Amino acid sequence: GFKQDIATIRGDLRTYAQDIFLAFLNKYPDERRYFKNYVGKSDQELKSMAKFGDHTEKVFNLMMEVADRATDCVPLASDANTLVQDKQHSSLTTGNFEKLFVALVEYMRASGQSFDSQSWDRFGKNLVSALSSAGMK
Ligand code: HEM
Numbered sequence: 001g002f003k004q005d006i007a008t009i010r011g012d013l014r015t016y017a018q019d020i021f022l023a024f025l026n027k028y029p030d031e032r033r034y035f036k037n038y039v040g041k042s043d044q045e046l047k048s049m050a051k052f053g054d055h056t057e058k059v060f061n062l063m064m065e066v067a068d069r070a071t072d073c074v075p076l077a078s079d080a081n082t083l084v085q086d087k088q089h090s091s092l093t094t095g096n097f098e099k100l101f102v103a104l105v106e107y108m109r110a111s112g113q114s115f116d117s118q119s120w121d122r123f124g125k126n127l128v129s130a131l132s133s134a135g136m137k
């Protein structure tokens with residue numbers, strides 16, 4: 001279930017973080033231009049970049065924290081607010097986050113692993129709603 005998935009993802013955090021983030025940029029190429037140092041690089045070129053590994057680790061580390069603090073796949077309003085008030089995410093709309101979770105849920109289904117994809121779908125949707133409520137457009 002959801003709680004086991006957080007353990008699975010944490011167990012190989014860099015590998016999952018990089019793969020899902022890559023699935024996200026490739027499915028939604030417009031989102032690549034938010035990350036200027038990732039423009040014009042192939043999957044393996046990005047995986048050879050130290051800063052890509054580091055960034056993706058930190059993102060999925062935080063996502064797992066929010067997921068672990070969540071009750072029944074609903075994240076904390078203060079966790080949502082953190083994402084909304086952050087300098088780096090100030091010029092985003094909830095649409096960017098929705099796309100990340102589509103790519104994440106798709107990835108889970110296409111993998112061979114027994115991920116609880118429906119719980120991650122709910123989690124994504126509840127996070128998006130919590131982002132709107134905190135003032136994200
Ligand atoms: C729940 C989902 C997300 C989480 C948990 C998250 C978290 C983070 C964190 C912790 C950082 C700082 C990493 C560091 O210190 O290097 C960061 C950077 C950033 N994120 Fe996100 N993020 C999420 C979704 C998104 C989305 C959907 C976008 C837009 C496509 C986005 C755009 C950015 C940008 C532009 C930066 C700054 C780039 C840089 O470090 O040079 N984030 N994010």
Ligand SMILES: [C-]#N
Binds near residue numbers: 059
């Ligand atoms: C943030 N990626």
